[model samples]
Target: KKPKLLYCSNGGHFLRILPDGTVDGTRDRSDQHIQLQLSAESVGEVYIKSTETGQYLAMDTDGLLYGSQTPNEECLFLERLEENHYNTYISKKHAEKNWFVGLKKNGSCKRGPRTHYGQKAILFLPLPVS
Candidate 1:
């Protein structure tokens, strides 16, 4: 299976999966590398999954990013490639309001409403799994 590490632009961290079914950014790619699978028929729609736990990355209505055991609408994200050569994951369920997945400078999650394409916190690099 092909896996990739999502490198956050702001904290220089990789998206990591926690044992408690939570998600965060870490300095290493070991638990951070995950599989991005198609969630819909349209291009760029994907579901972020933890390779080990098989949990799906999800975002709540309050813009909270976490891990869910079963796939749901909140687990779907639209992967977009911006002009800055970085990728952004927009919540499929909350895309109408432009909710973007982001990480803070200290490797914490950023609220979706405060995220934008121009912000480094919301930008990510999909690095090949090593």
Candidate 2:
């Protein structure tokens, strides 16, 4: 399935990784460059990729998110259930890393450590084009 715009909070900007690797969302065009396409690889797993950059959302060993051409273990994610979008897309590469997508105060997006009340962690719903 294709990803619709995350739309975020009312005063919020959509989350997308810039080509320059700036995860900030304070000022983004909100176009396809920042448009996300999330597809399920398994029943409870998915891959988040940028439609504009044609890159997959990946987490580094240091727990940072970047766009990648390949869907490696670093790119795989399993939703953090029972913990509760706001579901957390815990990195399958290192579940021990305790990292998930969280927005920054600057309104930018990044992979952050586990937080019980992550205000930035939000529910996303994207749709395929008709």
Local accuracy of candidate 2 as per-residue lDDT tens digits, 1-130: 5555554442466666677655544335535566778788998888887777778878788777777787888888875443322355677887776676666545656555532244544433233433
Predictions in order: lDDT: 0.81, 0.62
Show model 1 residue runs off by greater than 4 Å.
32-41
lDDT against true structure, model 1: 0.81
Q: How close is candidate 2 to the true structure, as a TM-score?
A: 0.73
Candidate 1 per-residue lDDT, tens place, 13-66, comes to 888767686677888655533444334436788888877788888899899898
Instruction: Estimate the lDDT of model 2.
Output: 0.62
